[PDB]
Amino acid sequence: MKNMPENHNPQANAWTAEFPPEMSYVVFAQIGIQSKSLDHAAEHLGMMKKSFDLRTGPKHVDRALHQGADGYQDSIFLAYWDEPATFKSWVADPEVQKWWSGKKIDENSPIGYWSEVTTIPIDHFETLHSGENYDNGVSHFVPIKHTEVHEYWGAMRDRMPVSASSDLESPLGLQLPEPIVRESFGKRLKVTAPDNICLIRTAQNWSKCGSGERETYIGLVEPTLIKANTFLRENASETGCISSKLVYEQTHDGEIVDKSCVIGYYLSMGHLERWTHDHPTHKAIYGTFYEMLKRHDFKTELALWHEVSVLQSKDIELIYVNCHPSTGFLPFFEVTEIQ
Ligand code: HEM
């Protein structure tokens, strides 16, 4: 509790995941089919859906839809394992090998494939939940406990165990350049990330909200979350944000539900902290959130949560097959053709 204010007394409760002692890693896989029309993605999305039901499949998996650049959409699965060896065995399963790593994607194909697989060391991971909710990413399969370590600037860092001994910094005084345009269509590309990047999934869940809370969330809060994410996508150098996606979650059948989340990679957790604490875009969000809590008596069915991880280069595998150049990590760092 290095950053906790003196006599800290949070006003709102919060919960955080408490991992069992035999758990050393969480595998968080984002797998995306990229298309201009969802009909072209239908066949791929069927094969992958069945693969998640294998005995070696993820402990939990969400679907989400992302509207990306230039009319291209990403149909994404967000899949979790609590054992890397089980995930490795799922990949090697022959049904998965039919489509893994864009194997079905030709160089003249109308769809793209991408995957960003992060193997998260547990001491480099933390979660926060506005309520005792068992349907928030890892809280589907990991118990959560009440925490006082929240509601101050630095609490995220303090909730992450390794920050007791590590600064988690990126190189001093250096920034992301302007994004570079790659010739990524028709190619199988691999990107190598630097050490200590920070990945956040921060989520909004209003499916249990009544008439009043839903109108206030859609009308007041969501517009500024969108503005936040748009700003982040367009100001990589200034913010340190490598990649930011606002996605809307879907049923197994792909119908949109009243849930969204932002998935962002940052050059370091300090970059994420500086944006969150000092930028007006989020200051705005936090301000329309308290203005919504003032319109409904600070009694909320809205549910928020986030998962934050700090990754070494070798913890994350970034593969883009026949993808648009602005996808994910493609505009930054070292790209390599896969043979
Ligand atoms: C691009 C979207 C967002 C990003 C990247 C983001 C990021 C963060 C981060 C990193 C923190 C922890 C800061 C720290 O502990 O030092 C935080 C805290 C917080 N955020 Fe956001 N957030 C986003 C959207 C939202 C939304 C949509 C809401 C509410 C509707 C929100 C409300 C809050 C609140 C209330 C806290 C305080 C949590 C606590 O009790 O510690 N944020 N956010």
Swiss-Prot record:
It is an enzyme of class 4 (lyase). Pfam families: Dehydratase_hem. Its EC number is 4.8.1.4. Optimum pH is 7.0. Keywords: Heme, Iron, Lyase, Metal-binding. It catalyses: (Z)-phenylacetaldehyde oxime = phenylacetonitrile + H2O. GO terms for molecular function: metal ion binding; phenylacetaldoxime dehydratase activity. Optimum temperature is 30 degrees Celsius. Its cofactor is heme b. Catalyzes the stoichiometric dehydration of Z-phenylacetaldoxime to phenylacetonitrile. Prefers the Z-form of phenylacetaldoxime over its E-isomer. Monomer. Belongs to the heme-containing dehydratase family. This is Phenylacetaldoxime dehydratase.
